[PDB]
Design a protein around this ligand. Sequence first.
Ligand SMILES: NC(=O)C1=CN([C@@H]2O[C@H](COP(=O)(O)OP(=O)(O)OC[C@H]3O[C@@H](n4cnc5c(N)ncnc54)[C@H](OP(=O)(O)O)[C@@H]3O)[C@@H](O)[C@H]2O)C=CC1
Ligand SMILES: NC(=O)C1=CN([C@@H]2O[C@H](COP(=O)(O)OP(=O)(O)OC[C@H]3O[C@@H](n4cnc5c(N)ncnc54)[C@H](OP(=O)(O)O)[C@@H]3O)[C@@H](O)[C@H]2O)C=CC1
Ligand SMILES: NC(=O)C1=CN([C@@H]2O[C@H](COP(=O)(O)OP(=O)(O)OC[C@H]3O[C@@H](n4cnc5c(N)ncnc54)[C@H](OP(=O)(O)O)[C@@H]3O)[C@@H](O)[C@H]2O)C=CC1
Ligand SMILES: NC(=O)C1=CN([C@@H]2O[C@H](COP(=O)(O)OP(=O)(O)OC[C@H]3O[C@@H](n4cnc5c(N)ncnc54)[C@H](OP(=O)(O)O)[C@@H]3O)[C@@H](O)[C@H]2O)C=CC1
Ligand SMILES: C[C@H](CCC(=O)NCCC[N+](C)(C)CCCS(=O)(=O)[O-])[C@H]1CC[C@H]2[C@@H]3[C@H](O)C[C@@H]4C[C@H](O)CC[C@]4(C)[C@H]3C[C@H](O)[C@]12C
Ligand SMILES: C[C@H](CCC(=O)NCCC[N+](C)(C)CCCS(=O)(=O)[O-])[C@H]1CC[C@H]2[C@@H]3[C@H](O)C[C@@H]4C[C@H](O)CC[C@]4(C)[C@H]3C[C@H](O)[C@]12C
Ligand SMILES: C[C@H](CCC(=O)NCCC[N+](C)(C)CCCS(=O)(=O)[O-])[C@H]1CC[C@H]2[C@@H]3[C@H](O)C[C@@H]4C[C@H](O)CC[C@]4(C)[C@H]3C[C@H](O)[C@]12C
Ligand SMILES: C[C@H](CCC(=O)NCCC[N+](C)(C)CCCS(=O)(=O)[O-])[C@H]1CC[C@H]2[C@@H]3[C@H](O)C[C@@H]4C[C@H](O)CC[C@]4(C)[C@H]3C[C@H](O)[C@]12C
Lengths: 258, 258, 269, 270
Amino acid sequence: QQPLNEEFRPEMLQGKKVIVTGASKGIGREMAYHLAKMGAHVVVTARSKETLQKVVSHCLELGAASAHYIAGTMEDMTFAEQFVAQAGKLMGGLDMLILNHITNTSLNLFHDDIHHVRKSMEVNFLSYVVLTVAALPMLKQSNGSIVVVSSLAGKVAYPMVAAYSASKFALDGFFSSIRKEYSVSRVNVSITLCVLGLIDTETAMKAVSGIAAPKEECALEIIKGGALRQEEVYYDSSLWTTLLIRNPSRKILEFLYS
Amino acid sequence: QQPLNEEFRPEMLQGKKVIVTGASKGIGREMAYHLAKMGAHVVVTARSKETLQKVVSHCLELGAASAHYIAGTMEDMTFAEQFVAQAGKLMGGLDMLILNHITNTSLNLFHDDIHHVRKSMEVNFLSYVVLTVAALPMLKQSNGSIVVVSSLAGKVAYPMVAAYSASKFALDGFFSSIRKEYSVSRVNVSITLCVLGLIDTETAMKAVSMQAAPKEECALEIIKGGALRQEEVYYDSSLWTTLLIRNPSRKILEFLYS
Amino acid sequence: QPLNEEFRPEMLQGKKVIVTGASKGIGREMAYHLAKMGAHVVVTARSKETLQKVVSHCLELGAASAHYIAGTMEDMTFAEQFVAQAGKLMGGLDMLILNHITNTSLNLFHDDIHHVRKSMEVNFLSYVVLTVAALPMLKQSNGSIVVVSSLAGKVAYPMVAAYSASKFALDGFFSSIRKEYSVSRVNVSITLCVLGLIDTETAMKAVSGIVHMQAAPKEECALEIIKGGALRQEEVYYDSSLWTTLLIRNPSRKILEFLYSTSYNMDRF
Amino acid sequence: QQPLNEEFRPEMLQGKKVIVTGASKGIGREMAYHLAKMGAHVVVTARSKETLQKVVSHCLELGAASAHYIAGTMEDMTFAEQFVAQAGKLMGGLDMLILNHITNTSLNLFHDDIHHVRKSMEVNFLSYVVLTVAALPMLKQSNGSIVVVSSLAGKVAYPMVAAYSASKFALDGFFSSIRKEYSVSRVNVSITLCVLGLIDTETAMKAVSGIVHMQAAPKEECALEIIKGGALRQEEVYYDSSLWTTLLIRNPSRKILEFLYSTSYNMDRF
Ligand SMILES: NC(=O)C1=CN([C@@H]2O[C@H](COP(=O)(O)OP(=O)(O)OC[C@H]3O[C@@H](n4cnc5c(N)ncnc54)[C@H](OP(=O)(O)O)[C@@H]3O)[C@@H](O)[C@H]2O)C=CC1
Ligand SMILES: NC(=O)C1=CN([C@@H]2O[C@H](COP(=O)(O)OP(=O)(O)OC[C@H]3O[C@@H](n4cnc5c(N)ncnc54)[C@H](OP(=O)(O)O)[C@@H]3O)[C@@H](O)[C@H]2O)C=CC1
Ligand SMILES: NC(=O)C1=CN([C@@H]2O[C@H](COP(=O)(O)OP(=O)(O)OC[C@H]3O[C@@H](n4cnc5c(N)ncnc54)[C@H](OP(=O)(O)O)[C@@H]3O)[C@@H](O)[C@H]2O)C=CC1
Ligand SMILES: NC(=O)C1=CN([C@@H]2O[C@H](COP(=O)(O)OP(=O)(O)OC[C@H]3O[C@@H](n4cnc5c(N)ncnc54)[C@H](OP(=O)(O)O)[C@@H]3O)[C@@H](O)[C@H]2O)C=CC1
Ligand SMILES: C[C@H](CCC(=O)NCCC[N+](C)(C)CCCS(=O)(=O)[O-])[C@H]1CC[C@H]2[C@@H]3[C@H](O)C[C@@H]4C[C@H](O)CC[C@]4(C)[C@H]3C[C@H](O)[C@]12C
Ligand SMILES: C[C@H](CCC(=O)NCCC[N+](C)(C)CCCS(=O)(=O)[O-])[C@H]1CC[C@H]2[C@@H]3[C@H](O)C[C@@H]4C[C@H](O)CC[C@]4(C)[C@H]3C[C@H](O)[C@]12C
Ligand SMILES: C[C@H](CCC(=O)NCCC[N+](C)(C)CCCS(=O)(=O)[O-])[C@H]1CC[C@H]2[C@@H]3[C@H](O)C[C@@H]4C[C@H](O)CC[C@]4(C)[C@H]3C[C@H](O)[C@]12C
Ligand SMILES: C[C@H](CCC(=O)NCCC[N+](C)(C)CCCS(=O)(=O)[O-])[C@H]1CC[C@H]2[C@@H]3[C@H](O)C[C@@H]4C[C@H](O)CC[C@]4(C)[C@H]3C[C@H](O)[C@]12C
């Protein structure tokens, strides 16, 4: 889309109505806290009821306009649908949908685990589509934004994360296609895809113990990208990563072909 | 993987045992016919037994070492699994698995069509994984090859094909990751991803009603790439397309990051 | 770094600008744009007769002043003396537009070392001499150098070997001194312009057949060069087709230059 | 051009007739030594007869079919032309021309040394053209090869090497253009451009002292990769301590656009 030709400021999120998924820990939790400090209305979700309550209480302490949680698993597509409808009622609308959750993923070779492939596709990809469809009427009303959190393994191939990579590549294909559609149909909803290197969440640090950028800063850069309506955000400890992983030729060919 | 350092010869397929899916029409049918002319053993599949019988009869006329069909839908993951077992039984093993079928797809904006997204992911992606898992023991025995048919819309973003693009991107992520795993684990099974522009199949010509490439030639280039164990085949009417769509920097970064 | 503003013609009002190779083609069009913007201009080329016509039209168009000095850029003494004279006449210098080339036609290289040498002297070395002569004045004004180059100064083509050598040399030289000015805190911008086929008389005599119809307008080309210089852009890419200007860019080069820059210690210099 | 679709073998250089310029020290000297070990005929040049004589002595001991030197400065285009003729006479022809010399260059900011700029252009660039013109008839006879030694600073920009970078960029523009001309004119002479990172020659090691702290690649290995690339008729050789450098500095998009652009124009004319 057309990004905002503006400097980010935290007041861009003041009073904005934001869903954050996968917000009980890791990057999602940090995004909830940043949003709370900016004075946003937030609804957080994950499976962990008790941790979500603690996240909500801290968001209120930090200055959230309001904060609520709804607990459930994004394996359940009915839950996903119902979640968005309830979150919208809790906030009186929706300005930004931050899709961040994933199913449990560790480093292993692919041997015959079709169940993990299916579960990864359902939780990491299909649930994002279901959430988007449920959110789109509200986002069209607010000229809002969808933020999709992805990965280096969603842009290039790695061993040991085959099922995950499939799901993150699928997000790029799906959301980059609907971005093109929203441009031609003049739907004023931005789509931001975030491509992350190694981030120091507990999940990642445990996953890479047998082989990191700060999660607070990562979370802020994701929000900034969404607020500025950027097509993509690249975040890593090293500029070697963020500068070289970019594929400007793809965007050029998409334009020239159109 | 390492591609064979030699020119293609049709004799490379003589007596080879090959599965072709989506082989009742389009590129799949043309691949069956080329394989037949080369004296391969072929097992073809699609949903329509009537059309498949016609393909088998023509394959035998053309010189196939043997030809059989098994009809079913790749919506049914049990069928996918049992199909590979039966095809292997019929031929006495498997040298090449050509994964080509897709669910019916036309050009349309995405609105609230979760059904098509799920169907596309199941038929176009998950069934390919199920088929690969079922085929891998036989392919390991033969040091064989997997050929995955994909698309320009599986490498860059287009409007009007969101569900389809998600599934084709997913293929790239998944199969490119397992390719990395087979290299580190020294599994001698090659994986070839084919990226196709507009090809003059009846399906395509109806869907787009620019220059369309001939399906006979397309089919042959797919077989050549698989036989030569190339990582990727790019095929289009124009060299502007096949040369510019390639992304060598991705392959370089994957290597550097390893 | 480039100015984060839209171009306005008032940015050149009262500015003191040299344009070389300005008797015809893109250089003449640049002089005309500058004149319309109310700049002070000094133009040069070998031919006094054609330069007279450019100066007279510049005055009609509303130049603050317009003058020519004729000479050949084969003569490095002329190059040096020309800048001193032009700057003294105008009372300073804000922009140096380096645009001239030696006469080049399309042909296979045929042992004509004389042409390789002449290309290197006129198209490349004279640009360096002009720059050295201008830099004190440009430092005084926090001014700009604009170097006009070519698609054949970024990728290789047959039939223009000597010319391409000279334009590649400009990129290597000027891109290196740009980096030096960054570390030495010299506030003089350098803009390298990469031009496709432009409908100058020279180009239209050189090319063949339908290629003539694939040329971009010289008036527009000239304005984009001036805009790039005024905005202190590092590079300007101009062509009749977006397929050209988008695909010919090599962003990986600037990325690697940046990534490589931390590994040397400039404190000695 | 089309590279040979085969693995390098040292016998590819046995009995071949090779010129190496700038061969009294550094990479050039190492190239002479590898060629000698492969049983090539070699003629080496540089300004210093004393250092050239030592190279020839070692080449003869290593097993060169023959080894000679001719001393002179490549500032003198007359010497350049006459050198190639004499080298050709000494060997009875020419199979490979390796152009490697440069004028003395150190790291410094550019101020006003137009003399250094001109000398760089004359020694590092124009003399290569003169040598090529002199050699080409012999190379056409043998379906031979030209190897042009260049630099990271001949592909991307660096401060402190402005005059040198201009000359190496010029080599790319010129020799890449002639490669295209040889393709349309059906001249069966290969051109290989070599792009080198930091190599542990005495010149480089002295020059970067205190400025740079990175790995330097071995000059012996560098020299061998240059010969291999030339022997295999490759368009470009990239050599560095790190695969990060050699893989990322290559620009396949340029080669693709040149090809696509060529399909649009008819070269029968001019
Ligand atoms: N950290 C890294 O190095 C990288 C991270 N990323 C991306 O960043 C995002 C966040 O990663 P990170 O913070 O490390 O991950 P974490 O594991 O810390 O967080 C994942 C979140 O999703 C939730 N979640 C897990 N399963 C389900 C489910 N079935 N339904 C609903 N929610 C669930 C978790 O909470 P609960 O257990 O309470 O349900 C948790 O809140 C992911 O999209 C990921 O792909 C990408 C590349 C690298
Ligand atoms: N033609 C083109 O322009 C392009 C083609 N491609 C790719 O090439 C491949 C072939 O395309 P094309 O030849 O045009 O397609 P066609 O529509 O001509 O053929 C599709 C085949 O798949 C079968 N099929 C459809 N649904 C199912 C199902 N549920 N289970 C099993 N088989 C099914 C069909 O048989 P039946 O209906 O009898 O089951 C048919 O045999 C596809 O992978 C596609 O993505 C990519 C880009 C462009
Ligand atoms: N037109 C095109 O398609 C392209 C143009 N360019 C570039 O744009 C620039 C201008 O091109 P264009 O406008 O076509 O060129 P022109 O041939 O129209 O103009 C050349 C100018 O340079 C002068 N000149 C020639 N020889 C000398 C000399 N020895 N000393 C001083 N001046 C000399 C000429 O005047 P006089 O003869 O009286 O001295 C004339 O003023 C050039 O740098 C070129 O490389 C790049 C790519 C394409
Ligand atoms: N080493 C490195 O890090 C890098 C090297 N390169 C390239 O590799 C090539 C070789 O470099 P390197 O081995 O370090 O250089 P050296 O300084 O070791 O060798 C240069 C050679 O050229 C000769 N030479 C110098 N001036 C003249 C002259 N006027 N006429 C004829 N010969 C002359 C020298 O001998 P004498 O003085 O006796 O004439 C010497 O034989 C060069 O082309 C360079 O650009 C590129 C990038 C990096
Ligand atoms: C750490 C690796 C590799 C990152 C990488 O490849 N980084 C760039 C190159 C770095 N190198 C040092 C190799 C070169 C740097 C050049 S430099 O010169 O700068 O040093 C990356 C690649 C795939 C990533 C996992 C997946 O996402 C899935 C999952 C998501 C969860 O949420 C967190 C857990 C997990 C397992 C992720 C953790 C981690 O994130 C992984 C392992
Ligand atoms: C035709 C378009 C666009 C192709 C394209 O973008 N091609 C390169 C650019 C060419 N230009 C526009 C630049 C022309 C200039 C010529 S020049 O020489 O200058 O380059 C492509 C993009 C997506 C493709 C569909 C999907 O796969 C899904 C589906 C698969 C079935 O199986 C067949 C049907 C269908 C609907 C496909 C048909 C067709 O295949 C589509 C529409
Ligand atoms: C015309 C060619 C090629 C341009 C090119 O490669 N352009 C992009 C690709 C275009 N395609 C092939 C894709 C066709 C698209 C046609 S489309 O209509 O679709 O756009 C370019 C390449 C080198 C150029 C000459 C040099 O500078 C030297 C000299 C400078 C003078 O000052 C003017 C004269 C002259 C002889 C120049 C003329 C012209 O400028 C040349 C021949
Ligand atoms: C050393 C630098 C920079 C090299 C570079 O940019 N290399 C790639 C990047 C590597 N990184 C730092 C990113 C990673 C290394 C990780 S590491 O573990 O290694 O620290 C390069 C760039 C330009 C080079 C000079 C010119 O040619 C001219 C001249 C030629 C002579 O013949 C030898 C002398 C001299 C002065 C040359 C020496 C040296 O050659 C220079 C300074």
